[PDB]
Design a protein around this ligand. Structure first.
Ligand SMILES: Nc1ncnc2c1ncn2[C@@H]1O[C@H](CSCC[C@H](N)C(=O)O)[C@@H](O)[C@H]1O
Ligand SMILES: Nc1ncnc2c1ncn2[C@@H]1O[C@H](CSCC[C@H](N)C(=O)O)[C@@H](O)[C@H]1O
Lengths: 502, 510
């Protein structure tokens, strides 16, 4: 189970670099390095997308690297190589990379390897390159460490990994039952954290990992190390963690009064109990511009994943007594509502383009055709006044990736990575065109096996029919017929709006 | 400022020893050692109370030990020694002690000194003696450490201790400002913690104290160190921290099943976020009896400090359907109510005996007089069935201390220690007979100066009046001053009766 992590997508690093006034290299011709890449699930899909780029993963585990290379051979990729070696084996002969991704390693490795990671992110980084390093942080990690301590101390039962996992689990359940009637805040925190741990699979409970030491960085100590290597802080990959606007305005003005972003970020870590950071680093020499304005939205392609409570053909967009509701990435609650004809036209245009970025001009022109082409100015005004605020709060995505051609649904066609995963892989998820893991059931997976752009609906349904009778697939003959076709159109919608169709 | 800590009282250690089947040494002739005694405010009041007991303090700070010796000399005590030396200087020549008190020390000292504290608590402890060691604990200490890390980080502004203090205060208020509207639970925990910290004085916030390393014990790690020295866990001095009865029965059954008290205690620390322990240890070879029965209440004198909502003379206790309310140490917020006439009679009896220990026979016979002396057996049954449960939950105090004879309020007489504190010391608090600091206002402190067991009420009032006229005490009406000789005499006579009640109920009168 080697997952892609969308937040490490080189196009995301490049986007964030653009936001802050850095011109990062074009992704399609770039060179990309992943440190501690495991079996390559966070790297291989990019190699498939960008045959003109070059990819290098490094991991100390020979079994993971062997699995990486097996999938490389299977996909026919000529642009990617995996090396079984330590990070500490990397030297100047590896060359310079435009993007360096190190996700979930630096907290778990000894000091000599942490120092090496910083040194590679300097020496092997291109002039305008971007380095990603993610790590656990105090104060938020305290609670996790406590539970690990708890599970180790009560786990002296037997010697086996397997046997010990079961009593770790029933210790989590025992904790739940213990706190049943407790109203204190700490009981609430511990109960939720234990519930999370219980949900996880055995690889995360296995006690050899529980015993592993975490570096327990504070942000300012991490940055101390990065600055020793002449790297400066660019951004967190979730920019909403940098948002100061939900705080009292005197406080915000005071935070701006001192100008250093590391101290401000550390302060926010202290008062928010921050447990994890996904940090972007770049070379000291670059001049970063943190002054962001509304018009900056025009620099980017935009995604706002919103689902309207009422369909478009049932509403009159110029009826301003009607407050219409849109659910964000979903949904119920966690939502927004508008009375504006212009904001309605904008939100309806985003809801037809889910996970398919639109330029400022594309969004506003398409919304204007819903307003009879008369409103372009008012629409541009409404988007300008709002977009960047919602981006900085994390509701809207910006990307340097371009709008994708509308998929043709007569003969639905998924991607090379996805067809491969559906045919040859046991996992119940696939990697979409945004480098996001998308969960699928058995019906959706078997159906993805057949979307090459050739087979029509009847053909795909028949190919799946080969699978149901000899399972393989079992759906929870005529009932099977229209049960299968009732599942078809919603599946196509899910694939088309989750960037699984080409 | 050197406070007494009532929880370290050797009579409290002895009481807990008795609860668990240990016969600890008689307090009045004992030998008592305090490690890291600072200025001796936790030791000196016992030397005053127990002329036939011997007391030894040890502290590394010359300034503190000098203050302790100044107060010993001021009090004229011959039974107490204060030594300026390290705990590492203690050896077999110091002799054996029946009680050893180490409070707020071991978490703050290097590993070698911690080793030595355990060693002393074995080698210098009498056969039946009790050692007390308190320390900060994980997981609860995480938050405190975090705030200290924050303060040190956010004030690094070179070179000025007072200015660094001002920056740390500014920081803490800035925190409170930042979290105002935010409703998340972490924000609330942090908010009140920084509130406590802002409340304190400058010596707790000085960066050199913030930089000091805490040992950060888990309980099982503390007990591992104690066991190396052949010390076993007796109990926590707040026994309510040991109580499992508020947890689901199946959980309580599993905990009871594992039959390891140190593991059970650790589990409770994890699920309650325990931040501090006050631990009693004793030699490994003593047989500790953990089976506690209702009738064990008969072994102890008892205090339950309850204030009735309604005066006894306004209620009929024999009424069984009326719900009567009682407020604990306090209160009006935290209370206990009952319709039982027998529990009512017991509760009014405790309310008349505040902070004065009562035997089982005393509680039940006095309760019976309220029920017309026909109820003795029912009242004994009520106390039997509820008392030890309330003890283990922390509501009722048990003590090996004797019942004290009633103070005669005619010529009120306070104790040697508090008459010293009131006359000769700047502090606004005094140390009562139970080793508790009791806050006093200016009128109460002045009054205490004059209660020698000779001055009657008229003479005490005349003395205080002299202070009001000398300019050293002012009385607000309020908020206009009351300046006329008569009418200040009037007001003083108004204030005297509740003051004598408060002293009487706070164990300040002999
Ligand atoms: N010194 C070293 N050099 C190269 N890889 C290392 C290393 N030390 C640890 N690793 C690798 O670092 C990884 C940490 S687990 C994280 C793996 C992957 N990025 C993911 O999130 O799924 C493991 O695959 C381990 O084999
Ligand atoms: N090695 C050592 N030997 C003797 N005293 C020490 C010591 N290390 C620290 N101390 C003393 O331990 C005390 C810690 S502060 C706690 C003091 C006191 N028990 C109270 O609670 O008020 C300080 O007075 C310090 O001087």
């Amino acid at each position: 189970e080697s997952y892609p992590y969308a937040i490490t997508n080189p196009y995301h690093l490049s986007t964030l670099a653009t936001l802050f006034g850095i011109n990062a290299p074009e992704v399609e011709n770039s060179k990309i390095l992943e440190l501690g890449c495991a079996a390559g699930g966070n790297l291989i899909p990019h190699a498939v997308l960008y045959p003109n780029a070059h990819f290098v993963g490094v991991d100390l585990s020979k079994v993971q690297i062997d699995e990486a290379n097996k999938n490389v051979r299977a996909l026919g990729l000529k642009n990617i190589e995996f090396h079984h070696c330590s990070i500490t084996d990397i030297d100047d002969s590896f060359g310079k990379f435009d993007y360096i991704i190190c996700h979930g390693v630096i907290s778990w490795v000894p000091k000599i390897v942490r120092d090496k990671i910083f040194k590679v992110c300097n020496r092997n980084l291109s002039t305008n390159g971007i380095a990603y390093i993610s790590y656990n942080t105090l104060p938020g990690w305290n609670m996790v460490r406590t539970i690990r301590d708890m599970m180790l101390y009560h786990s002296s039962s037997f010697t086996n990994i397997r046997d010990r996992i079961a009593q770790s689990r029933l210790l989590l359940e025992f904790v739940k039952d213990s706190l049943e009637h407790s109203k204190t805040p700490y009981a609430e925190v511990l109960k939720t954290e234990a519930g999370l741990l219980a949900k996880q699979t055995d690889h995360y409970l296995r006690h050899d990992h529980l015993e592993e030491e975490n570096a327990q960085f504070y942000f300012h100590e991490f940055m101390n190390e990065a600055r020793k290597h002449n790297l400066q802080y660019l951004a967190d990959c979730n920019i909403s963690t940098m948002y100061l606007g939900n705080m009292p305005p005197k406080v915000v003005e005071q935070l701006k009064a001192v100008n250093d972003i590391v101290r401000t970020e550390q302060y926010m870590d202290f008062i928010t109990n921050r447990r994890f950071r996904t940090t972007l680093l770049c070379h000291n020499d670059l001049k970063i511009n943190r002054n962001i304005n509304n018009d900056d939205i025009k620099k980017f392609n935009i995604i706002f994943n919103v689902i309207p409570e009422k369909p478009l053909k049932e509403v009159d967009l110029n009826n301003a007594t009607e407050n219409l509701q849109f659910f964000l990435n979903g949904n119920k609650e966690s939502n927004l509502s508008t009375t504006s004809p212009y904001m309605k036209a904008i939100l309806y245009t985003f809801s037809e383009n889910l996970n398919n970025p639109l330029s400022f001009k594309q969004v506003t022109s398409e919304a204007n055709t819903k307003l009879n082409n008369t409103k372009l100015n008012e629409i541009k005004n409404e988007l300008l006044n709002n977009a960047m605020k919602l981006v900085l709060q994390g509701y809207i995505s910006i990307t340097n990736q371009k709008h994708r051609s509308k998929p043709v649904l007569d003969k639905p066609k998924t991607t090379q990575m996805v067809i491969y995963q559906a045919k040859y892989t046991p996992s119940m998820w696939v990697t979409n065109l945004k480098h996001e893991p998308i969960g699928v059931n058995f019906f959706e997976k078997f159906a993805l096996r057949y979307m090459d752009g050739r087979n029509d609906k009847k053909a795909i349904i028949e190919a799946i029919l080969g699978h149901v009778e000899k399972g393989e697939l079992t759906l929870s003959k005529e009932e099977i017929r229209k049960e299968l076709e009732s599942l078809f159109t919603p599946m196509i919608e899910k694939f088309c709006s989750n960037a699984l169709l080409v």
